[PDB]
Structure formats: C-alpha cells, structure tokens
Amino acid sequence: AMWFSWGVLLNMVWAGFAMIIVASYTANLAAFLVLDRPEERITGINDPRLRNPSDKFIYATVKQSSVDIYFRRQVELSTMYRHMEKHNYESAAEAIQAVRDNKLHAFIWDSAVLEFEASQKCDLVTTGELFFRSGFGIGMRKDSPWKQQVSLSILKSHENGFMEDLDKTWVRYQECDSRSNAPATLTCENMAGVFMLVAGGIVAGIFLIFI
Amino acid sequence: PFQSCLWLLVGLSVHVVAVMLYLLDRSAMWFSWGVLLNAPRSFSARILGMVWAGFAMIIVASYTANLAAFLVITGINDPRLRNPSDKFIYATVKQSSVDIYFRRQVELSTM
Amino acid sequence: KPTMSDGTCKEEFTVNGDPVKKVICTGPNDGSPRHTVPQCCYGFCIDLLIKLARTMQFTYEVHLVADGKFGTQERVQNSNKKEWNGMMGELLSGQADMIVAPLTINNERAQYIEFSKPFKYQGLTILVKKEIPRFMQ
Amino acid sequence: VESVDPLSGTCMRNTVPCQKRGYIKKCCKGFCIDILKKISKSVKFTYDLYLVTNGKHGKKINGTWNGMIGEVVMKRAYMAVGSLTINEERSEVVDFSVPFIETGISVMVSLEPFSACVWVMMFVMLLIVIGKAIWLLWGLVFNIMVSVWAFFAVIFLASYTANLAAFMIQEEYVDQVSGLSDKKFQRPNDFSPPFRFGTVPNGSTERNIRNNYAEMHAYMGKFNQRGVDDALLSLKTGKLDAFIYDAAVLNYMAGRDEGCKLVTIGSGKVFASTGYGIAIQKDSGWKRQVDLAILQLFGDGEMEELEALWLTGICHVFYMLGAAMALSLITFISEHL
Amino acid sequence: EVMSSQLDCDNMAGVFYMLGAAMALSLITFIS
Amino acid sequence: FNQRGVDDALLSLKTGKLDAFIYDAAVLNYMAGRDEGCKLVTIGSGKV
Ligand SMILES: *[C@@H]1O[C@H](CO)[C@@H](O[C@@H]2O[C@H](CO)[C@@H](O[C@@H]3O[C@H](CO[C@H]4O[C@H](CO[C@H]5O[C@H](CO[C@H]6O[C@H](CO)[C@@H](O)[C@H](O)[C@@H]6O)[C@@H](O)[C@H](O)[C@@H]5O)[C@@H](O)[C@H](O)[C@@H]4O)[C@@H](O)[C@H](O)[C@@H]3O)[C@H](O)[C@H]2NC(C)=O)[C@H](O)[C@H]1NC(C)=O
Ligand SMILES: *[C@@H]1O[C@H](CO)[C@@H](O[C@@H]2O[C@H](CO)[C@@H](O[C@@H]3O[C@H](CO[C@H]4O[C@H](CO)[C@@H](O)[C@H](O)[C@@H]4O)[C@@H](O)[C@H](O)[C@@H]3O)[C@H](O)[C@H]2NC(C)=O)[C@H](O)[C@H]1NC(C)=O
C-alpha cells in the first residue's frame, strides 16, 4: 500500500486528491510567480508623497537649476518648492549618488539624464509620469546671427540621421536592461535548494533505507 | 493557439519520428501516440524517443501555459467625453441636477 | 575626465570602433579651495560642438562653469540688484560666448539670452531607487 | 474644423471663427487653437484666422512655395498656426517659434523559463541515478528509492509550467520595425513578400525621407496615399503594411482609435526628432514675444493640461527536435563503428 | 495580493471533504 | 479595549495587540490609502 500511495502521489479517490493536489500546487506556483509584491512606486509628480511631503519621504533636485526655477515661479507648487529648498544638492552627481545610497526618496531631473542612469544602473529607476516637456538648446548672448546659424545647423542635423547616430552612440548605448517584463526566468536558487533536498533525502535513503 | 498549423506540424513531425524510429530499428505508433498522450525499448533510437518525450513535455507545457494565458470609459475624465462626436453619444436626464451641474460651468460647456 | 601625465586624453574607441574625440576644458579640480586646471571633456555636447565647428568654421576654447550650477537669477548682496549666476552668469558677463551644455529652454532665461532649436527634446521626470528583489512548499 | 452653429448663424462654444475660400465661415477648435488663443491673450493682439485654400502644410513646386509657408512668405498671412513641422527647408524663407509639441517621423504598424544551469543540473542528477537507469531517470522526469526522484521531477514539471506562464505574461514581443537604418525598408524587393509602406505627398516626412534615403522615396513613389484617415483604413484593410507619418499625429491616432490594433513603432521612438511650431514673417518683431509666451506656457504647466485635454488617448521547440535528428545521425555513426 | 495558499487549519475545507465523501462511499462499500 | 490615539491604535493593529479598529470612515480610508506599507485596509469594498 505504501508503494501504491507514494507511487500515486509522486505519479480512485486518492488519485483524484493527488491530481487535485498537483493541480493546486501548479496553480499556486503560477500565482506566486506571474504576479508580484504589493504595488509601491511613485506615480509621477501627482503622487501624494510629493504633494504633502514629510520627514519620511525626502525628495529634491539640483540647487539653482531649471527644476528649481520651475518649482519657484508657481503658486500651486509652493509646498513642493518649500520642501525641496532644504534638500537640494549642488550637482546632479551628488543627488544621484544620494538616491543611490538610500539618502533621497526621489530626485527630479531631466529625462535624458535619469533614463540614462536607468541604463547604466539597474538599481535606479525613473518614475511613471512625465512633466515639463521642454528641451535643451545652445546658449546665445542676446540677439546674434550665430544663433540663427546654430539653429539652422541643428535643424539640418535633425533633418538627417546625425542626432540619431549621436543618440545611438551615447544615449541608446545602454549597459543595463529594462525590467518592464518582470518574470524573466526561473531562479536557479530554488532549483538548487530542491536539488540539495532531493540529493539529501536520496543520500539518507541510500544510507538507511538501503540496508 | 497556432490553430491546425502547429498541430499538423507536430503530427507530421510525429509521423517522421515514427518513420525515423522504424528506420533506426530495422510498435513505433504506440510509442509515439503513447508518449504524446502520456512501446519498443532501445532499438538504437531510445535517445530519439527521449528527445521526443522532451518535445512532448515541452508541447504539453506550452499548451498548458498558452491555455493559462488565454484565460487570465475611465470616468468623467475620459477623452470620449471631453471631445465627443457622432460616434460616442452620451447625455443625462433633461432638466435635472446633472443638467444644472453641466450648465453653470465654463470648462464644462462642450459636454 | 582628468588629464594624463602630459596633459592628454586616452584615445578610447567605441564598441563599433569609433574614435571618440575629446577637447581640453579648463575648470575647477574640486570646504573647497579655488583651483583652475585643464581637463578632458568628451561626450554628446562635445561631438555636437565639433559638428557646429565643422559647419561654421570657428575656433573654440572650451571651459567649465566657475560654480556648479547651470544658470539661475538671484538677488545681489545689496541694493537689490537682479544678477544671474551660473553658465548664464558667465555668458552675460562676457566670460563666455556660447553655452553648449544641457541647457533647458524656459521663459525666465529666454528673457535675457537667446536659445536655438532644441537638439534634445527631453523633459522632467523623477528618479527613484528600486525596491528589493532577492522546493520551498 | 467644425461647421458653424445653424441654430444662430454664427460660431458657437469656445471655438474661434475662421474663413475658408468668396469665403465661408467655419468654427475652429483643438490644441493649436487653444495655444493661439492663449498667446493672443498673452502677447495681446487681435487675429483673423483663416484656412489655407492653396495646398496643405507646405511644399516646393518650382521656385515658389504652395502651402501655409507660402501663405506666410507671400505676405498673405502674418503667422501660421497648427500642425506644422519645423525643418531647415521651411525655416529658410520664414521663421519659426519655440516648439510647443515635440514630434517627428514615426511608423505605426498593425525552453526560455528553464535556466542554463537547470539543464546541466538535470543531466548531472540523471548521471548519478547506467544503461537503462538513465532512460528510467530521464523517463520519470517527464510524463523504491526512485520515488523521491519522481516527486522532485513532478515539482520540476510544475515549475516548468508555472514559470512558462510567467514567461508568457512578461514578454510582450511584437513585429516592430527595425528602423530607417534597416534593410527591411531599404530593400523591400529582397524578401519574398514586398513590404508595402508609404507616406503622404508634399509633407515634411516625405521631404525628409527623400533627403535621407533615396530608396525610400523611390519605392514609396507609387505607395503614396492621399489622406491620413484613408491611410489608416488602408492599414486596417490589409493593402498597406506600415505607415510613415508625423509622430504626434500617429501617437494621438494610436491613443484615439475605433479599436486598439494600431500602435506606433517601438516604445514610442521617433526618427528625425523635431517639433511643431508657428511660422511667422521673417525678420519680424513678434518672434521674441511669441517664444516668451510659449515658454511661459511651458513654465506655467498649462501645456500639460492642454496636452491632456486634446492629445489624451484611451488606448494603450521543433528546431531542438531537428538538432536531435542530427544527434541521431551522430549516434547512427557510432553504431556502425 | 500575491502570496502562498495554506487553506488554514479549521472548518471543512477542500480535499478533506473529498476524503469524507470517499469515507462515506467506503462506508457504503464495506457494508455491502 | 479602548485605545487613545489613532496612530497608537493603528500601531497596535500592526503589532498584533488589536484585531480590528472601529473608527471614523474618512480617516480610516485616508490612512489605508496612505501608510508606511500596504497592510491596513477598510472592511469590505468601502462600506460604512
Ligand atoms: C501634392 O502636390 C502636388 C503638386 O505639387 C499635387 O498634384 C496636383 O494635384 C492636382 C489635383 O489632383 C492636379 O490637378 C488635377 O489635374 C488633372 C488633370 O489635368 C486637368 O486639367 C488640365 C488643364 O491643364 C491643361 O490645359 C492647360 C491650359 O488650358 C488651355 O488654355 C491655356 C490658356 O488659356 C493654354 O495655355 C493651354 O495650352 C491650353 O490650351 C495647359 O497649360 C496644360 O498644359 C494642360 O494641357 C486638363 O488639360 C486635363 O484634361 C484635366 O482636366 C485633373 O483631372 C484634376 O481635376 C485636377 O485638376 C495637378 O495636376 C497636380 N500637379 C502635379 C504637379 O502633380 C497633389 O495633389 C498634392 N497632394 C495632396 C495630397 O494634396
Ligand atoms: C587638483 O588641483 C590642485 C590645485 O589646487 C592640485 O594641488 C596641487 O598639487 C601639487 C602636486 O602635488 C602640489 O605640489 C606642488 O609642487 C610643486 C613642485 O615643487 C616641488 O618639487 C620640486 C622638485 O620638482 C622641489 O624642488 C620643490 O622644493 C617642491 O618640493 C610646487 O612648485 C608647488 O608649489 C606645489 O607645492 C601643489 O601644492 C598643489 N596646489 C595647491 C594650490 O594645492 C592637485 O594636485 C590636483 N589634483 C590632480 C589629481 O590633478
């Protein structure tokens, strides 16, 4: 009866309960892999942790920067500005290093930079939403013909694949990856533990149940 | 999924597997259909039978996974209401509180 | 990147075999004593500057910002005088002739200095540290 | 452009009046309309809006233009608002404002779970537990001390299914275009079924494609279609594979569609990065104030609101067996050794 | 809402109900 | 079983000294919406 039970379990009513236990095991193993942990992330600038910040969630930006100006000259961004104006860093590097060393909870900055830091570092991920769709330009002193020349040159640069190659050799040159598709493959650690347990039981069985 | 394409492909591959097994031996049908639906031993083609069992297990796993995959207005701020047309017709009760709500409001004119 | 022993940049190529160019850029070495030393600038804005120098034939002397910021206006120490600090602060003072850098095009800065067509249509997002990943029946 | 209100005889709602040529009255709304109203309320100037009756966006016939740009350079209209792509060509005769909407050229088309160590660990465990022993161990892996090894194998099956499902819920593969730097569009006659893709004539995308890749414009010379909606319907029908068109328009069209089958190429990348703008008279005095106005709209954040008001969207094995046959041929060579 | 299922340790849950029905069937098969 | 302080009661519920907590609807909804983690939740779909 032992060989029958252990044979049916490890592959009429007992076979039904065995098939049910196997199906339940497979279903639970699928549910504990296809899904994920409770959602905990920043949904953009409209996130409640930024609207009414505290000592728990500390976020800022680069001191004396475009973000600083953006948060400055606006009435509905008064609280956020008042909050950031006490944690701002002198450079972007120190801020990234801060949010990397778990000093900051968030860091407002350019997408062309933050999405680049998510390409050269898997521990740093950009937020959800995107605001202030501006752009980077060439600084020109007052009204100068060099402004028109440079602007025409940039227009001609975008006209072809110059900026495309400039992006493919600097921006698109990502070293890391994107975990948008979270369950990539099965962890080898679990299979290692299963192999350890199986080989252990097989060893103990070959040392006891053998003779 | 994949309709009768992958089905007839796996079927022709099964017939080719039985043909290759019969060519390696000199029964095969019972082995192929037996391994596929869950039987000569050895015959210098047992490895091909193991590979066929692997392909069968992969087929079963793929079928189960695909069977599990093919089984398992955003409010007032919906774009279908912000800029309506003759396709998305919506309204309310004439001379009601909703009517009053949408009436006296500058940003709720269009609706 | 810091210069070599004889003031030069290591000709490092790309993965495809592209010789990345570099230009000598004088700036600060590093609660912080003032010190001006030449360094090696290389990247997007540098290649773009090389392209602009290729199109419009003009010699250039690349240098870094005296401070660590970009360009924001601020009140003076006295008499309430609006003065810009940063790269724009150097551009208005004549210390610089052109700003080739991640310079956001906004309304406040445009009222003093002119901007060209956006060579990088970026935006403003948030950077957050990722969470914890890391036969058990 | 919506028709005027027949219940009054004039333009209704928050729409602005615009003529269309001997000209009839028509109401105008949308994104660039709100932008125009905002900058008219900022720069403070009265404006007479009207639809162009000579061409569309802007092209170059012989030596003169025949679009909105032509309407500007011929002193027939001071400014030009709407979907107008900025390039080096148009910016030569007229001027452009700071881009309020970023766009460009884009296209809109219609064993993995098991780790590499798992395959070696299974073969190593089968080697430890020969002759028929290997066949029994590998046979029990699929579908009395071996019983335990069966139990584990059962688990190994469960995971092999579970993970697979996960691997089916993770990866979202699609027939994405390999870009403009690919041979998939540079050589449509190379493959067996000729990829049918085209664009609109007299456009900025058509003027940029012919100046970046002659082959594209050469092949799309007969694959060109008139009308964006007609092109979309051609995509839905099956007479057209992909569509090369403006980025913003394609994004909105992908966001707002009768169904949800159409989608931009890739995650949302755009070749030839540019942006919409406002074409005004060359060497004018409004360029400065207009730029300051639009940038003020950027700083205020109203641009995001207007982008969420109008541009808002509602959408968005056997080969291994063949290798076993090669392994069977290698095993057939050892049998006759 | 992703975790592990243990089906608790109280009341009349699954499997045990099937074992009970099998016990009743066995009671009807042993008394026959 | 009366407890003083809403935060203390929530901390007691997170500790295990309190099974449930009967309190104002809005405060509990906000507290469940915004917390240190995502463990606390209102009874039912949102009945009051
Ligand atoms: C993108 O941009 C391109 C252009 O850049 C657009 O293409 C134009 O599209 C329009 C609309 O489809 C085309 O116009 C069509 O033409 C066809 C065929 O021609 C019709 O009209 C001609 C008239 O020309 C003849 O006659 C004149 C003069 O007539 C007589 O008297 C003259 C003086 O009194 C004398 O000088 C003449 O000698 C003559 O005796 C001649 O000058 C000319 O040589 C011709 O003989 C008729 O002859 C035809 O029978 C026919 O009716 C029409 O069928 C259509 O109705 C429409 O009018 C235009 O040709 C296109 N141009 C080009 C260059 O392609 C695209 O449409 C744009 N795309 C989008 C999406 O907007
Ligand atoms: C970053 O910038 C800093 C600038 O503030 C750099 O600091 C400087 O570093 C140098 C190198 O160590 C310091 O030492 C200098 O040495 C020279 C040489 O004279 C000596 O050697 C001769 C023999 O050759 C000997 O006969 C003399 O008696 C001296 O012993 C001196 O002339 C200088 O005065 C100086 O001592 C500098 O002191 C230091 N400058 C400052 C202002 O601190 C720093 O090196 C830079 N870092 C990098 C990585 O480049």
Ligand SMILES: N[C@@H](CCC(=O)O)C(=O)O
């Ligand atoms: N945006 C283009 C028209 C649309 C297109 O060519 O994709 C223009 O202004 O010329």
